[PDB]
Amino acid sequence: TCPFYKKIPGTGFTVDAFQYGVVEGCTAYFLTHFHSDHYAGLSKHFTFPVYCSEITGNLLKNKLHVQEQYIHPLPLDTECIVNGVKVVLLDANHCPGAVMILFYLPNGTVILHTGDFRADPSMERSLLADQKVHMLYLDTTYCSPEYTFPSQQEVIRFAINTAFEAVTLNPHALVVCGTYSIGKEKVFLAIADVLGSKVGMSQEKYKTLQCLNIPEINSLITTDMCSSLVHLLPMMQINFKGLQSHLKKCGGKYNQILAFRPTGWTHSNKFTRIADVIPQTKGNISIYGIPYSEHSSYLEMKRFVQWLKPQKIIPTVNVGTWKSRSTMEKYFREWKLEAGY
Ligand code: NI
Numbered sequence: 001t002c003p004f005y006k007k008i009p010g011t012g013f014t015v016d017a018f019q020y021g022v023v024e025g026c027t028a029y030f031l032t033h034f035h036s037d038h039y040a041g042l043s044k045h046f047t048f049p050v051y052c053s054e055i056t057g058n059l060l061k062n063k064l065h066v067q068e069q070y071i072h073p074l075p076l077d078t079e080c081i082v083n084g085v086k087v088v089l090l091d092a093n094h095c096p097g098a099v100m101i102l103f104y105l106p107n108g109t110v111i112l113h114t115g116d117f118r119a120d121p122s123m124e125r126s127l128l129a130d131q132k133v134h135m136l137y138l139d140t141t142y143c144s145p146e147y148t149f150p151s152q153q154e155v156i157r158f159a160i161n162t163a164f165e166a167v168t169l170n171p172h173a174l175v176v177c178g179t180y181s182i183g184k185e186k187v188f189l190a191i192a193d194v195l196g197s198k199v200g201m202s203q204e205k206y207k208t209l210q211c212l213n214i215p216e217i218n219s220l221i222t223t224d225m226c227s228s229l230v231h232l233l234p235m236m237q238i239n240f241k242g243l244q245s246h247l248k249k250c251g252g253k254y255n256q257i258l259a260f261r262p263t264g265w266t267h268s269n270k271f272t273r274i275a276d277v278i279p280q281t282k283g284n285i286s287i288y289g290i291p292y293s294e295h296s297s298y299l300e301m302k303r304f305v306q307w308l309k310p311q312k313i314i315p316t317v318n319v320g321t322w323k324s325r326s327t328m329e330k331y332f333r334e335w336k337l338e339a340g341y
Contacts, residue, residue, distance in 0.1 A: 032115025033098030034059040055097025058211035095183030119304035136310040173256035178235035200228030309341040
């Protein structure tokens with residue numbers, strides 16, 4: 001049954017709660033971004049209103065086949081009314097089309113639901129700078145001080161230069177990048193750009209990317225693998241066996257693969273900088289793990305909450321155990337006590 005932390009009080013509104021049948025007294029379902037843990041349950045057979053960004057609208061329509069009439073796309077940074085409740089959607093700096101939701105309750109309460117976010121100082125000068133926020137429903141995925149990782153711009157640097165060097169030392173090397181959802185497109189689009197290639201991919205992944213309103217995208221991607229020297233493969237397939245497998249299929253056009261697995265945090269973040277990374281090498285194939293995150297580090301989350309100064313925080317991630325919950329509460333208390341709200 002839908003959990004308390006997916007329900008917005010004083011509304012008929014729910015957030016990312018698509019896998020509990022009909023929710024008793026839900027007039028409208030918000031969807032923060034197109035990722036499976038958040039959309040789980042959607043199909044062509046939904047007949048309640050969905051509110052989402054334009055881009056998430058495209059994904060619903062074309063990949064899940066939801067009927068146009070139940071998708072209500074909203075523009076960002078725009079005061080909108082939804083069943084007589086003022087809302088606003090803001091970029092979540094997560095994957096394409098991912099939003100935070102501001103709710104202005106009739107009773108005068110103001111709630112922010114972050115969806116999945118990577119906090120950034122650019123948020124401190126959005127529509128949020130204007131007014132007080134009583135309740136924060138928070139993406140707590142990395143709410144613990146061990147969780148440090150580099151800036152996205154540092155990681156894209158590393159990737160750009162690794163690939164470009166290798167390709168210039170051996171122009172019959174192929175670059176592969178792993179994937180399984182939307183998000184992290186900059187990894188492959190940055191490498192492709194430095195190498196002067198479109199990115200080659202399957203038909204299903206080409207369709208996904210064609211929904212995303214990326215500018216100039218027809219110039220940046222293709223379904224023709226032969227013509228392209230940056231390939232996208234299923235992340236499951238990014239391993240020696242599956243790379244070899246694939247290295248056979250190109251038909252003697254490349255002698256070497258350099259691959260990238262963009263990862264979430266991995267324990268080796270604790271002991272090694274970005275500038276000092278190494279790959280796993282079994283012959284002519286080489287695989288880099290690179291910690292490109294689309295969630296807030298501990299310190300990024302901390303800055304954001306301390307600026308916001310919310311009266312109450314409700315966690316949406318890592319709520320499943322009491323140890324996680326208890327650890328998280330302690331961080332909230334410290335932060336508040338440090339910042340004097
Ligand atoms: Ni997500």
